Amino acid sequence: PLIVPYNLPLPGGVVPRMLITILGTVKPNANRIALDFQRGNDVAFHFNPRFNENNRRVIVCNTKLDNNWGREERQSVFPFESGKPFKIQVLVEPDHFKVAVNDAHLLQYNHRVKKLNEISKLGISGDIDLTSASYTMI
């Protein structure tokens, strides 16, 4: 019921205790999913499940500054499956984003962009049917 790519504004940026929840279903024969927490043109946190990178499934995380991608942090634990519904929860903590998928902790990503209050948009894209994109304070 939501258009993809989807832009979710994050008013006044992010802050510790902010929980962002994305519900969707992976399409059959999916290639990629991307969450992009943006600070203007910069990407503070790119969370990028890849379903077929040299016949491997991997999650690539990174930051884009001044149009340049930085050093990739790769996670081989891969909780997504083509055709299946998922929940991604991103909890903002003082020193990292903490990601859980389907209620199971997946990874953390240390804050490289430090102006948390300027990370004011989340872009959601890729091979999914998007059901819900929302946030709350815990």
Ligand X SMILES: OC[C@H]1O[C@@H](O[C@H]2[C@H](O)[C@@H](O)[C@H](O)O[C@@H]2CO)[C@H](O)[C@@H](O)[C@H]1O
In this structure, the number of other CB atoms found within 10 A of the CB of residue 52 comes to 12
Give which of ligand X, Cl ion, none residue 35 binds (C-beta under 5 to 8 Å, depending on kind): none
Is 75 annotated in a binding site? The answer is yes
Is 81 annotated in a binding site? The answer is no
Which residue is nearest to ligand X, using beta carbons? 62
Per DSSP, the three-state class of 29 is: coil
Structure tokens at 51: 């379903």
Smallest separation (angstroms) from Cl ion to the CB of 44: 8
Give which of Cl ion, ligand X, none residue 115 binds (C-beta under 5 to 8 Å, depending on kind): Cl ion
- If the CB atoms of residues 23 and 65 are measured against Cl ion, the closer one turns out to be 65
- Is 114 among the residues that bind Cl ion (CB under 5 A)? yes
The string over 3-34, giving b where at least 16 C-beta atoms fall within 10 Å of a residue's C-beta and e elsewhere, is ebeeebebeebbeeebebebbbebbeebeebb
Give which of ligand X, Cl ion, none residue 48 binds (C-beta under 5 to 8 Å, depending on kind): ligand X
Smallest separation (angstroms) from ligand X to the CB of 66: 14
Structure tokens at 89: 């929860």
Per DSSP, 27 falls in state P
**Would you tell me which residues interact with ligand X (CB under 6 A)?**
46, 48, 60, 62, 69, 72
Which neighbouring-strand residues pair with 129? 25
Binding residues: 69-75
